[PDB]
Amino acid sequence: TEFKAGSAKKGATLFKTRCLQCHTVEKGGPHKVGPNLHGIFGRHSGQAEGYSYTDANIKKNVLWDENNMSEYLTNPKKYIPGTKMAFGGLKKEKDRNDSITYLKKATE
Numbered sequence: 001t002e003f004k005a006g007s008a009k010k011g012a013t014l015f016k017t018r019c020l021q022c023h024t025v026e027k028g029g030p031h032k033v034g035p036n037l038h039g040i041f042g043r044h045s046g047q048a049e050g051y052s053y054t055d056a057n058i059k060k061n062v063l064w065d066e067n068n069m070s071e072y073l074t075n076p077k078k079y080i081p082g083t084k085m086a087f088g089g090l091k092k093e094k095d096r097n098d099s100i101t102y103l104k105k106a107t108e
């Protein structure tokens, strides 16, 4: 791809410190500020039920792949103009590789 496997352990911790404040990953976990991310790969954006996404996330109709996800983690607002995900971005590809490495793992 344009994405290469990284550290699943490294990623778990990137997640704990940069994504847990607003999200859960497990099947049957709850929606918090952001949606629960279980099964997000291959899924399109704005489809978890019981969660109020913005008009923008929804209309972007993004098919979430390790690659797509990469772009998005760089600069969310950049990738999805008007999204309410208040996250700066992960500029370091290595960081993204790690994080996505875990998400790929944890969200199945």
Ligand code: HEC
Binding pocket: 015, 018, 019, 020, 021, 022, 023, 033, 034, 035, 040, 044, 045, 046, 047, 048, 052, 053, 054, 055, 056, 057, 058, 073, 082, 083, 084, 085, 086, 087, 090, 099, 103
């Ligand atoms: C709270 C300050 C958040 C942090 C930190 C992170 N995200 Fe988030 N995320 C949040 C919201 C409010 C939303 C919904 C946006 C909208 O416009 O409705 C999101 C959304 C996502 C998505 C898209 C979900 C989908 O289409 O189903 C992804 C893929 C996602 N968030 C991932 C993610 C990761 C991996 C994060 C850590 C680096 C992270 N987010 C931070 C809120 C917050």
